Tab-separated table of all heavy atoms in Angstrom:
chain	number	residue	atom	x	y	z
F	33	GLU	N	-39.819	4.156	82.649
F	33	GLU	CA	-41.018	3.195	82.280
F	33	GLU	C	-41.931	2.946	83.462
F	33	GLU	O	-42.236	1.868	83.856
F	33	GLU	CB	-40.379	1.878	81.923
F	33	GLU	CG	-39.800	1.832	80.490
F	33	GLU	CD	-40.622	2.518	79.375
F	33	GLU	OE1	-41.976	2.291	79.487
F	33	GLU	OE2	-40.089	3.257	78.633
F	34	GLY	N	-42.249	4.210	84.224
F	34	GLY	CA	-43.189	3.992	85.289
F	34	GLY	C	-42.468	3.647	86.627
F	34	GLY	O	-43.251	3.470	87.623
F	35	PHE	N	-41.165	3.451	86.614
F	35	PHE	CA	-40.425	3.115	87.823
F	35	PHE	C	-39.752	4.379	88.354
F	35	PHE	O	-38.984	5.148	87.829
F	35	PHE	CB	-39.307	2.257	87.467
F	35	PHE	CG	-39.844	0.731	87.301
F	35	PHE	CD1	-39.373	0.037	86.158
F	35	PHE	CD2	-40.873	0.152	88.031
F	35	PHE	CE1	-39.775	-1.187	85.907
F	35	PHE	CE2	-41.166	-1.045	87.841
F	35	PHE	CZ	-40.702	-1.689	86.729
F	36	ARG	N	-40.189	4.690	89.647
F	36	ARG	CA	-39.601	5.892	90.367
F	36	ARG	C	-38.153	5.494	90.822
F	36	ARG	O	-37.880	4.527	91.348
F	36	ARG	CB	-40.473	6.328	91.491
F	36	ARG	CG	-40.033	7.596	92.200
F	36	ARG	CD	-40.228	7.669	93.672
F	36	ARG	NE	-39.786	8.814	94.326
F	36	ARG	CZ	-38.545	8.894	95.021
F	36	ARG	NH1	-37.781	8.019	95.065
F	36	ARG	NH2	-38.254	10.184	95.562
F	37	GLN	N	-37.180	6.518	90.425
F	37	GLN	CA	-35.938	6.350	90.777
F	37	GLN	C	-35.552	7.455	91.990
F	37	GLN	O	-36.017	8.570	91.808
F	37	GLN	CB	-34.916	6.480	89.655
F	37	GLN	CG	-35.383	5.704	88.368
F	37	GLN	CD	-35.360	4.246	88.648
F	37	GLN	OE1	-34.528	3.711	89.233
F	37	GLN	NE2	-36.303	3.511	88.051
F	38	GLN	N	-34.692	6.986	92.863
F	38	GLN	CA	-34.306	8.062	93.963
F	38	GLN	C	-32.999	8.540	93.665
F	38	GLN	O	-32.061	7.883	92.993
F	38	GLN	CB	-34.324	7.239	95.314
F	38	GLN	CG	-33.826	8.128	96.464
F	38	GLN	CD	-34.874	9.152	96.905
F	38	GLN	OE1	-35.986	9.069	96.536
F	38	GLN	NE2	-34.438	9.952	97.721
F	39	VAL	N	-32.787	9.842	94.079
F	39	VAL	CA	-31.495	10.535	93.888
F	39	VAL	C	-30.451	9.747	94.572
F	39	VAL	O	-30.532	9.357	95.777
F	39	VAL	CB	-31.666	11.870	94.455
F	39	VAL	CG1	-32.158	12.814	93.406
F	39	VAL	CG2	-32.323	11.930	95.703
F	40	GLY	N	-29.260	9.482	93.877
F	40	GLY	CA	-28.154	8.719	94.362
F	40	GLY	C	-28.246	7.277	94.267
F	40	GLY	O	-27.267	6.578	94.227
F	41	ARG	N	-29.425	6.738	93.869
F	41	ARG	CA	-29.653	5.336	93.748
F	41	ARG	C	-29.877	5.047	92.249
F	41	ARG	O	-29.105	4.156	91.661
F	41	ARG	CB	-30.785	4.818	94.573
F	41	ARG	CG	-31.005	5.444	95.889
F	41	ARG	CD	-31.896	4.630	96.795
F	41	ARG	NE	-31.716	3.123	96.572
F	41	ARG	CZ	-30.648	2.554	96.927
F	41	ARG	NH1	-29.600	2.979	97.490
F	41	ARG	NH2	-30.632	1.141	96.664
F	42	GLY	N	-30.865	5.562	91.621
F	42	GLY	CA	-31.159	5.282	90.231
F	42	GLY	C	-30.564	6.345	89.346
F	42	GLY	O	-30.552	6.127	88.015
F	43	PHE	N	-30.181	7.404	89.871
F	43	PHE	CA	-29.562	8.649	89.077
F	43	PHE	C	-29.060	9.630	90.014
F	43	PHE	O	-29.421	9.764	91.208
F	43	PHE	CB	-30.756	9.233	88.205
F	43	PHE	CG	-31.751	10.061	89.105
F	43	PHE	CD1	-31.694	11.409	89.137
F	43	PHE	CD2	-32.750	9.386	89.821
F	43	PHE	CE1	-32.624	12.050	89.905
F	43	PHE	CE2	-33.665	9.991	90.545
F	43	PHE	CZ	-33.661	11.423	90.690
F	44	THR	N	-27.956	10.363	89.581
F	44	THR	CA	-27.407	11.452	90.320
F	44	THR	C	-27.655	12.765	89.479
F	44	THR	O	-27.251	12.735	88.304
F	44	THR	CB	-25.932	11.170	90.691
F	44	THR	OG1	-25.363	10.821	89.434
F	44	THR	CG2	-25.877	10.035	91.730
F	45	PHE	N	-28.105	13.792	90.124
F	45	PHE	CA	-28.335	15.094	89.368
F	45	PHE	C	-27.168	16.065	89.895
F	45	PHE	O	-27.059	16.222	91.038
F	45	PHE	CB	-29.734	15.619	89.705
F	45	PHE	CG	-29.946	17.033	89.167
F	45	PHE	CD1	-29.911	17.278	87.809
F	45	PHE	CD2	-30.081	18.150	89.956
F	45	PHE	CE1	-30.106	18.596	87.401
F	45	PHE	CE2	-30.129	19.438	89.457
F	45	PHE	CZ	-30.266	19.587	88.156
F	46	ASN	N	-26.515	16.613	88.925
F	46	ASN	CA	-25.490	17.646	89.190
F	46	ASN	C	-26.073	19.033	88.785
F	46	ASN	O	-26.630	19.134	87.653
F	46	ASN	CB	-24.186	17.306	88.588
F	46	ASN	CG	-23.979	17.949	87.079
F	46	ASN	OD1	-24.867	17.895	86.380
F	46	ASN	ND2	-22.729	18.473	86.906
F	47	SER	N	-26.013	19.871	89.668
F	47	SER	CA	-26.455	21.294	89.504
F	47	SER	C	-25.675	22.072	88.559
F	47	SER	O	-26.197	22.999	87.942
F	47	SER	CB	-26.928	21.925	90.741
F	47	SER	OG	-25.925	21.739	91.776
F	48	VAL	N	-24.465	21.836	88.530
F	48	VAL	CA	-23.472	22.762	87.827
F	48	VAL	C	-23.747	22.564	86.268
F	48	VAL	O	-23.916	23.561	85.706
F	48	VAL	CB	-21.983	22.340	88.129
F	48	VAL	CG1	-21.079	23.430	87.580
F	48	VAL	CG2	-21.941	22.161	89.616
Side-chain angles (χ1 to χ4, degrees):
Chain F
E33 288 316 315
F35 287 135
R36 189 214 179 255
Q37 317 291 327
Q38 176 76 13
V39 278
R41 322 198 38 70
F43 70 104
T44 51
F45 175 69
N46 94 318
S47 34
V48 193

